[PDB]
Each structure stands twice: as C-alpha cells, then as structure tokens.
Ligand binder design. Structure first.
Ligand SMILES: C[C@H](CCC(=O)CF)[C@H]1CC[C@H]2[C@@H]3CC[C@@H]4C[C@H](O)CC[C@]4(C)[C@H]3C[C@H](O)[C@]12C
Ligand SMILES: *CC(=O)CC[C@@H](C)[C@H]1CC[C@H]2[C@@H]3CC[C@@H]4C[C@H](O)CC[C@]4(C)[C@H]3C[C@H](O)[C@]12C
Ligand SMILES: *CC(=O)CC[C@@H](C)[C@H]1CC[C@H]2[C@@H]3CC[C@@H]4C[C@H](O)CC[C@]4(C)[C@H]3C[C@H](O)[C@]12C
Ligand SMILES: *CC(=O)CC[C@@H](C)[C@H]1CC[C@H]2[C@@H]3CC[C@@H]4C[C@H](O)CC[C@]4(C)[C@H]3C[C@H](O)[C@]12C
Ligand code: NI
Lengths: 324, 327, 329, 324
C-alpha cells in the first residue's frame, strides 16, 4: 500500500503490499520472448524482460509491482473509491488496468519516455476474466534517473503527475496528497527552535520532539506523510546491502501490524510482503509477514531470451537461525 | 527505548534498543554459579541463571535487558533528565543502577515478589568505573503483569503497569495520563458522531488511526506501541508469537535519519530482543540483519561458573533463491 | 476568513473577516433603484435591495458579504493561490469577480436559482479599475432553505458545489476541504467509549477528551474543521436574540487574536469584524475587533425604493458599560 | 476553566468560567471592614478590600476569582479527580478550600508573600455548610510583578509552583501541563522553514501553517496549550482600553461554545462569563455568554471602609446597539 523510489547510489523501487486477502502472489520473471497478448494493443512477441511480484492465471502474469531490464519500474496500488476506468475508445491507446504494468515495462525504458507516450492513453474498463473483475488501481512509475510520476485515472480522465517525493499510497487524488504534505512543514527530525513560546524555557524532555506530530496511523494519508519523511532522511551513498537494508527499514516504519487496521469483524489489513527491486542490477529482494529474513532473486541468473514465466515462492515460513 | 511484555499464550519480554552509540553489546548467559560481586550487597555465588543482551567489562555482565530461568524479565531504558540516584544509605538495600538487572534476576522469581522486596531499596549513585547512566526499568513475569521502577528526585517509586510497555521520559504517571488523550482512536472506522447528519467521505481504511502518533519521540512510541501491543493476535504458537512480537516493535522502529540527536548523528534501532519466559529462549535481530536468530539458555550448562557469550550484531543474512547450484 | 449559514429557526448568514489591513469597509444598503453598471452585462436600474459590508469606491458598493431582501446571501473569501479568472468570452455570461456578490444579490432569490444560472457563467479577469486589481476570491451562497453552495473558479474553470456543512474558509479547493473533514470522524464533544485499549481502564482526566484532536490553528483547514463542528453542534429552535448570540459564538470559536497568525514580518491577520445577517428579516448584526458590543441595522427601516447608498459605520471603539458610575441620577 | 495574567503595561488578571450550571455568581466588592469568619483561623475584622466574582451565601462571598486593593489576584479552577484536601491538624495553618481566595486577598499583597506563608498551610476538607460540600479546586495567583504561582493540593499534599506561562486550566497536575507544552515546541504563528522534506518545494497553500497542530479542543490540556500561545503572542505596550480588548480576545480563543463540550445527555459546559481585573486600578471588566458588551465595576468608586458586601449583576441580557 506504500510504494517508494529510493536513490542512495543505485536506485531501488518497491512497496509494502497491505491487504486482508491474498491473490496467489509469487515472484515472476517474464523473459524477453514471452508473448504478451493485450486486449486492445498489438501483441508483442519480443519485448523487454521484467521481474516483479505477480499472480499467475492461465499462464498470464498479473503484476502487482515490477521492474524491467532497462531500469524502469511500475507499482500498482489500490485506488478504491477514487479510480475510474473508461470504455475502449476508437482514437486512443487503450491499456486495460490489469495489463498496465506489463505493457509499460514491456515497451518503454524511462519515465520521460512513459510521460510522452501516455498522452494518447485511455485506461480501459476491460477485465482479465469474468471471475476477475478489474480492481481499482493507480500507479507509481520510477526509473534510474531518480524521478518518478504518478498515473491516475479518475472521474475526470487520465492524469500524469510529476512526483516530487517519490512515494505513493492510496486515496485521495495525488494533488490532495501533496497539499496535505504541507500540513507537516514544521516537522523536523531533531529539536525545533522555541518560537512557540519565546521567552519561556521549555524542558525538551525527549529526543526528536520535532517529530511529535508525525503521523503513525495505518490510513493512507498517515503512511504517505511518514514514508515521505523516512525516505527523504534515509542515508545516501551506501553500497548494495546497506541500501537494501535501509529500504526495508523505510517501509517497515509504515508497516501495518495485524490488529491495527480493522477492515471487518476480526478482519485486518496487514503488510503481506515487502519487495525491493534494484533498477540497475535487476534484483528483487523481498520478505513477508511470516518471514523477516530477506530473500533475493536475480533476473540475470536466468535466460532472458527464453519464453516461459519463471516462478518462485514469495510467502515463506519464519527462517530463524538457531545459534546453540 | 521501547520495551514490552506480550502474553498471547506463552510470555515474551523484550525491547528495541535505539541509540547513536553502541556499547559492545552481545548475547550473554549468566549461569547459576557465576560470582556476582555487588558494590554494596552480599556477594551471590549461587543464584538463578539468566540470559540477555549485555556488555561485558572486567568479566562483568552489564545487562540492558534479560530474563532468568524462573520467568522474570527486567529491561533498562534511558531516563535522562528525569532520574535521580542517591548516595549509599545506612538503612536501605543499596543497589547500584548498573547492577539492578543482574541483582533482581539473580534473586527473585515473580514481579509480585520484586514489589515486596523493593520497599526498602535505594538505587545508589555508584558507577562501574564508566559513570552510571540514567535508567528506569520495566519488570515483567509469566503472570502477564509488569511493573515500572523509577528513581527520580522524589525517591524510589514502583508503579503497576496496566499497558505492559515502557519508553523513556516523562515520569510513568504522566505517560499513562497522556494515553487518555488517544481514547477516540480505533483500528477501523469510527461512527460519525463528529458531524451527525453529514455523510463523510470515508476515503481510506483505518481513518480511526489518523491521529495515532508516529513520531520518534518517547511519548509517541509509547502511545503507538501500547496500541500495537494491545491489538496484537493472541492464542498463538511459538513461531507466530515471536513473529508478531517483532512486528509490534517494528511499528515504533527508529529508521536512520528520522531521529537527529546531533549534527548528522542519529538515534536508530540497533537491535530488537524477544525473550520467552516459559522456555528461556532469546530471539533477536539487529539493524543490519533482519533475520531472527535464537539462543536457548537451557541448551547450556547452567551449572557452570563462566559467562557464555554469543554475537549480537550480524551482517545482513540474505537468502539467495535462484543460485542455480542444481544440487 | 470563515463564513457560515446557521439555521436554528430563522436563517443567519455571515462571516469573520480576518486580515492584516482594512479596506474602508462600512455597512452599506444598496436600495432597489441604485443603478448597477456591470462590466460586461446589462445595467440594472431596478433590482432587489441588499444590505451588507462593503467598501465604497466612486459611489459603487464593493461588497465583501451581503444579503438581499428575498433572503439570499453571498460572502466572498480569499482564494489566493487557488483561484483563476478568465478573459471575457462571447460564448459565456461574464461576471467580474469584484461584482459577483452585487450581481447575484441584485438578480436572484434562491440558491437553486443561482445554481441554474451559473451553468453558462464566466468569472472574468476584469478589475474595478486599472489601479484596483482584482483580488482572488471564492464565494459562499446560502438562502432561507438552510442549503448553500460554493462557487470556485480555478485552473479547470468554474465549479459549483453543494455544501453539506454550510461553511467555507480559504484554500484548498472545496472537494479537498471536505475530504479533510473525514480525518476527524472520531471526534465527539463528550467522551468516547474506550475502543483504544480494550481491557485497560483509562482515567478520563478531563472533560471533552473527544475533542482533544479538534484543530485550533489559524490556518484555513484548521478553521474549516473547527467551525463545521461548532456550527453542527450549535443550539437550535432559538428566538432572535438567542440565535444571533449563538451565531457570534460559533464564529468566535475560530477567531484570530492579534499575534497568532503572522503573514509577514511582524504583520498579523486578525478578526477585523464579524457580520450576522438574518435572511428572513433583513437585519445586519455586527461587531469588530475593537468593539465587542453587537450593533444592528435593519434594511427595512430604510427607504428601499430610493437610489443612493445608505451607509453606516462598521468599525467602532470599545463600548464599555460602566456600572457603578455613581451619577446617582 | 482558563485563567491568565496578562502584562502588556498595566497588569490584568482574569478567567473564563466554563460549566454547565451557574451558582448565582455576582460581582462582589468586599470592603475592608467586612468581617471574615474563618473555619480554623482567627476572624479578620479588618483587612484588604477585594473585588471579584462570587456566589453569595448567608452573607458570605464565596469567590471564584478576585483581586484585592494591593494588586494581588487569585482564581479558583476545578481540579476534579486530581485534588485532595486533608483533615484539620494542629501542626499547620488550616485554610478551607472555599475560603482560600478570601483569606489570601484579605491578608497578603504579593505573590512572594503568598509563597512564603504557604509553607505551613493545610487546605482542609472543611465545607462551607452541609448544603454546600467543598468542590475540588486549584488556584492561580498573580500580581503586579507579572509573575504567578500555581497552588495545588493533591495526593502528595500541598504544592506551590512558579508558573512560567501565566496561565492555568484544569487537570492534570501542573508539572504535567508544563511538560506537555514542549510537545508543541515547533508551532509558529507564521510559516515554518521546510526542514521537513529538504529539497522538496512544498506549496504553502494557507497562511499560518505553523499553527496547523495548535490544539483547539475543549479539553483542559488543549485549552491550556492554545491560551499559553495566545497570551504569549498578544500585543504589548497598550493603554487601558486596548489591553482589556486584547485580554478578552485571548480568552475568547479558548471559548467553549454551546454544543462543543458535552458532559451529559444534551448537557454542555460553555463559557458562562469572562472576567478581566486591572490589578493597578482595581477595575473589574466582564461579559457573559448572553451579553458580549463589556461592563466595568471600579472598586475605588465605593466606600472601602464600609462593612457590607456591595453586589452588582454579572449575567446580563444581550445589549444590542440598534443603529437605525
Ligand atoms: C489489493 C491490492 C492493493 C492493496 C494496496 O493498495 C497494496 C492490489 C494491488 C495489485 C492488485 C492485483 C493486480 C493484478 C491483478 C489485476 C486484476 O484486475 C485483479 C487481480 C490482480 C491480481 C490484482 C488484485 C489486487 O487488486 C491487488 C493485489
Ligand atoms: C533506547 C534507550 O533508552 C537507550 C538506552 C541505552 C543508552 C542504555 C540501556 C542499557 C544501558 C547499559 C546498561 C549496563 C551499563 C550500566 C552502566 O551504568 C553504564 C554502562 C552500561 C553498559 C549501560 C550503557 C547505556 O546507558 C545503555 C546501553
Ligand atoms: C479573510 C479573508 O479571506 C480575506 C478576504 C479579504 C481580504 C477580501 C474579501 C472581500 C474582498 C473585497 C471585495 C470587494 C473589492 C473587490 C476588488 O477586486 C478589490 C477590492 C475589494 C474591496 C476586495 C478587497 C479584499 O480582497 C477583500 C476585503
Ligand atoms: C471552569 C472550571 O474549572 C469550573 C469551576 C467552577 C465549577 C467552580 C470555580 C469556583 C467554584 C466555587 C467557589 C466558591 C464555592 C466553594 C464551595 O466549596 C462550593 C461552592 C462554590 C460556590 C464553588 C462552586 C463551583 O465549584 C465553582 C464555581
Ligand atoms: Ni450618567
């Protein structure tokens, strides 16, 4: 439910997926010569390869978030109550919602290139199957340049926003998310100067009183504000393992523990998995609620010119290293 | 920095330790026949065994948090600016702050019995050499109940802890009172008694947590962790319990960069310890290695007389999946 | 600024005006036969009478807030950084922003009528004079039905929204204001049931812990959320004096004391005046920062068929009632 | 429910009184030779004159807030659930809670005087009469030096605190009120500097986003924080009428409107009256919920050598000035 683009040296793209129902997700590599059959676009027999997290149904990857081999990344996040899809129209490039990640990563390589080519796009109301109605999504798109954009189809059509904070959660519309950001302009990671009650000595009784109003709620605006802050103040100039460890810490600070986000009677949205994808090197790191150890899958260990989905387990059991 | 007692079925006692300076911590078992040289109390050559996280100086275990073989846990958290120690007094049991954890765990079994035996105690200003840091303590046991032990300018206090958690400043009664400020928080959606007769755009799940504290400061972590701990799953086996415990503490984790205690110097979560009181096992991980390790105290010669030390801080232990070793 | 429509029995429309400098506002009655010379619309030599707070420039009322004799009210509030006006166009009915309140109150009777007639409207970039550039505004329109609308011209054009909370402040765009209200759905005036830490007895050490996260800042969102709450929970079924009294207290809940809203180097926005207009009776009640005693001007005690502005002072000195004067009269 | 000491030039001492029911309060001058019968202290047949707001019962002024002719002020505020009174004892000077304001103003002139002479005081559990059991109170005391103390009798006995912010509300204990102030140390009247997300240009869409976390609730803590802020930033170097005007506005910023503070089924705590007492001049200014016009009673226009209470009406009907 929280997606970030983290640029300490290399560039890392990933997300927490928080929900109360699973969708058979696995780690799925789609090689260069798997044939995408799009609903209303020309089928691509050869295309960029990609690795990400996906459900697989009737030999089709239904990606939740992924990156391709040229350093482009796309994540889809619930947009329930905000999104609107539109019927196929005879003068636009019609991408169905479930195939947006596939189509973008198969075809383009940079955010700037995605921007120039979404100008004719319509996100259509086409669903994958009758027993799989399209879900309401909006998308974060980042690349190796450290810049990202937000893609939102709503009542007023398709919108592409520049994303100055390289993060995204759920509702409301993206310009309202950014507006809300300014309500926390006074937050600081250390201690503020006392211009609150000038001339009075306040006992600064705790460290980091400058974050006393930083949101810790499980709702979409709270996670958006906190993760923007965590991401902006995270370390830079780190090697691979340090950068990947920091990426998980960032997303861990807005994780949803079971019991805190109630969505029905004893039904809870919680952080099902976290994914971390190196854009330069094509490596997908991940963990999940039940297993905190970080696993990794490298796209280049496989034959990118093959033509079948390569599939690994996402959800794992707790992998405790016993010491004595 | 954040310590909890979690009672889903078994009982788990542990803490995040958040700071900017490390103190050579390690896992440390103290067996029954290690000789405790107490600064102003009788030497204890035979005592309960215990396991925790500690620094070892001059062959002495300086514990941050630990449990003993009877199922009593004690954790020490920073109390800077709030605590006061006092000179050794003629009429009281004088425990030095740096040895409070060792003494309480070597001597007692239940939190109830720690309460009875604290009434004549004075926490002294004696240091190790290394001056004594300002701490207060959370004490908990297998009854699922816990106490707060604070020495401040008004003397030694012991408080029943109704939320089984503790962070840093201010004094514990103020922490508890501040909780009532969050009485409207719920994990789901509230009923709209805010603007009766108006249909609110409930645009997000869990709008009931919109005012839940997420700051890195001491009151914010206390309010969040109490809520996380109170709403965590119950009636669960060992591994699931341990998994939920670590998630509770991760929700009040301090990521590098968010808590600035100096010029480009940051307080962050250095390690997370989780200790099963029934089974004497210490699970832990640290900032650089997210994989949980375990040490079982009962798989050692608890009759020995030397300290058994293991490593705490480990490198990231990644599990590479598509190694193509084709075994 | 904060504007509200309040409906205990009669219907009361009005606002706080919060700012750092005054514009010569007075109480101004525009009678039925004052000739409105609009910028790109036909003049209206006969029209509804209206009373409100306005600046007078070249014998022209420049209303900040007013009501007309038929019980319609319009208030203009700062929309700086969100509003946009558009060049005059032939495909549309062009109303300049400085004349929106005058034109609507001269011409229309009800919020419904206003809605129907805004469907072809353009808020133009025309200014009263080359030397009085047009400020950025949005408007609250309410009437005796107890319903109101919000009128906003922004980047994407003109918009008219039903206002379910009968209040308005400044930025952001009105849909975003309503969204932000949901962030406070847990607020109650009394004490909440403890679903926070079930099983823990939390001492409710203060009354009204349910309002502990109610916003008190001077910013636009804070004042919007607080005044919506104040207005929703205010008493009903009151008679005249009682209703006016509660109206002023509602707007008082979000007033700006000097010193708390710094808008420039030692420059402060503060509540300059508060206006309360009975839609049914044509009576304008007011006080101001320096005088808390309420004053009243009845439109209907005046000759409404005439054609010159009838003008009364708005800002007054503090009007203190000295009790033990011992004039022993 | 909120009391302040305001020091723009002269010194002003006063309070909002918020509650759900009135106790027949009036403006009451007690002249120098009205005889006080104290429960456990010698009668004072002559003493300082005082003016304030009081319930009168059996020809006794039961003050809620008042000032004396030497420029000392005391205000009693509800302390329910925190305060404790103790049985009369021989070892101490026993002041009953209902008489605390009268005894202090009759006997002393400065806050320093009060501080010294409280070192042997017990606030007793004695009640004024069987029909009026003692309510739980704590007190703000201020004088013409511009400084104030807080007097609190709780579980651990009597406490006197210097008050750095010259304000007081209800629970919790005063050192906890002070500690909570530091949680708002980043609040500013204007725009903060963006140390929140460095490198990002936040759109500052509203004036005064620095007050976005200033409390506006009706609870005791919220009103305390906001009134400290209003009082700290209020104008200075003003003459009489401007100072009174700002004094009422300071207290209006934490006014309790009917409907916002529910204390039972359709029972509301609201701001019943506001008093503003000039310490130098002995003038009591007031208004009330039903009448926003300010009224004034001047102590020094009465014969302060008399011995009967001089009473004036406090609650008044809305006094509207009809212009035409
Ligand atoms: C519920 C969850 C988002 C909650 C957060 O915000 C985080 C979303 C994110 C990605 C979604 C899947 C995308 C691929 C197809 C598309 C098809 O249209 C429906 C099935 C499927 C698998 C989607 C299911 C579900 O909607 C997913 C997992
Ligand atoms: C997160 C937080 O509260 C920081 C606490 C941290 C700085 C404390 C916690 C335990 C302390 C050590 C206990 C043992 C010993 C005691 C001695 O008096 C000083 C030296 C030791 C190692 C303490 C150091 C430090 O204050 C520790 C780690
Ligand atoms: C509290 C707040 O929102 C401030 C609003 C305030 C500064 C506005 C509100 C009405 C404006 C006047 C309308 C009439 C006229 C219009 C003309 O374009 C410019 C001059 C006038 C007097 C406006 C001045 C100012 O923007 C006013 C008062
Ligand atoms: C806003 C707030 O804190 C409410 C306080 C309010 C209800 C208190 C304040 C002063 C109290 C009276 C003092 C005099 C007398 C004392 C006696 O023990 C009981 C009766 C009196 C009149 C008190 C009533 C009430 O508690 C008052 C008004
Ligand atoms: Ni006279």
């Amino acid at each position: 439910c929280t997606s970030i683009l983290y640029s300490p040296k290399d560039h890392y793209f990933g997300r927490n997926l928080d929900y109360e129902i699973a969708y058979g997700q696995k780690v799925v590599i789609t090689p260069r010569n798997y044939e995408f059959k799009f609903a209303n676009l020309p089928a691509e027999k050869s295309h960029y390869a990609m690795i990400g997290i996906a459900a697989v149904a009737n030999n089709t990857p239904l990606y939740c978030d992924a990156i391709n081999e040229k350093g482009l990344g796309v994540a889809g996040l619930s947009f329930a109550g905000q999104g609107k899809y539109f019927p196929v129209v005879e003068d636009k490039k019609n991408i169905a919602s479930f195939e947006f990640i596939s189509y973008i990563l198969a075809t383009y390589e940079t955010v700037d290139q995605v921007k120039e080519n979404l100008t004719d796009v319509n996100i259509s109301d086409v669903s994958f199957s009758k027993n799989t109605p399209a879900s309401e999504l909006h998308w974060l798109v980042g690349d190796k340049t450290g810049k990202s954009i937000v893609v939102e189809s709503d009542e007023k059509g398709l919108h592409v926003y520049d994303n100055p904070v390289n993060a995204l959660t759920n509702a409301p519309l993206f310009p309202q998310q950014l507006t809300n950001l300014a309500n926390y302009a006074a937050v600081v990671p250390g201690q503020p100067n006392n211009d609150f009650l000038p001339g009075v000595d306040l006992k600064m009784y705790s460290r980091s009183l400058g974050t006393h109003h930083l949101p810790g709620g499980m709702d979409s605006e709270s996670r958006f504000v906190k993760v923007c802050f965590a991401l902006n103040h995270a370390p830079k100039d780190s090697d691979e393992v340090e950068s990947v460890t920091n990426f998980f810490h960032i997303l861990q600070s807005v994780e949803q523990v079971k019991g805190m986000d109630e969505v029905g009677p004893n039904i809870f949205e919680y952080t099902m998995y976290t994914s971390c994808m190196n854009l330069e090197k094509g490596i997908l790191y991940f963990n999940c609620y039940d297993d905190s150890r970080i696993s990794a899958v490298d796209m280049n260990k496989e034959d990118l010119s093959s033509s079948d989905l390569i599939v690994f387990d996402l959800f794992k059991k707790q992998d405790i290293s016993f010491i004595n």
